[PDB]
Amino acid sequence: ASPLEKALDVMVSTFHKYSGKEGDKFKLNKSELKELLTRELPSFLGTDEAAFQKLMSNLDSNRDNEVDFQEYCVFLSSIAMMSNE
Amino acid sequence: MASPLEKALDVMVSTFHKYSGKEGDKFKLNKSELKELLTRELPSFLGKRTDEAAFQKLMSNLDSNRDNEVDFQEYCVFLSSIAM
C-alpha cells in the first residue's frame, strides 16, 4: 500500500480500537475519546474534564452526544489543517 | 515520540503537497495534479474505469468553492468520504 493508504488504515484502526470498548461499538463516548486523544494525539493535547467535554460537543455535529467515525475524520482533518498552516 | 496516528496525519499533509506543488498554485491541486495523486497514491480506491470523463466529474464534485482547484480542506473532505 502507498503511504497514504497506510495512513488512512491507521486512521480507521485507531478509531475502532477506542470506539469498541463501551456502548455503541462504532462511536466514541467521552471516556473513549479521552483515551484516544491522550494515547494517540499527545502532541496536540494542552488536560481537564471540561476540555474534553467541550471538544466532544464541538465535534458532535449530529447532536447524538457521541463521536462517530465521520465526526472523528472531520476532527483529524481539522488537526491536519492546523498543522498544514 | 510521534504516534502512528500523528505520523498518519503528517502523511495526509505531505502527500497533498507532493502533488499540489508541481504546477500553478503550490498549495492547491489542479485537475492534472489531482489525477496524479489519486492514480499514484490511492490505487486501491480506484474504479474499473479511470477515464477522463469520470475524473472531470470527480474534480467538480471536490471543488466546493468553485475555483477550479482542490485545496487542502477539499482534499480532507475527500479523504474523510472514502476512508471507510
Binding site: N58, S61, V74, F75 | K48, A54, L62, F78
Partner: peptide
Amino acid sequence: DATETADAMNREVSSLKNKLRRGDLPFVV
C-alpha cells in the same frame, strides 16, 4: 473544530459520501 466549521465539514462529507454510493459517480470505489 469551531462548531460552525465542524458542522459545515460534516455536511460536506455527508454530501460527498451520498454521491459516492447512493450513489452516482464512480471514478472512486
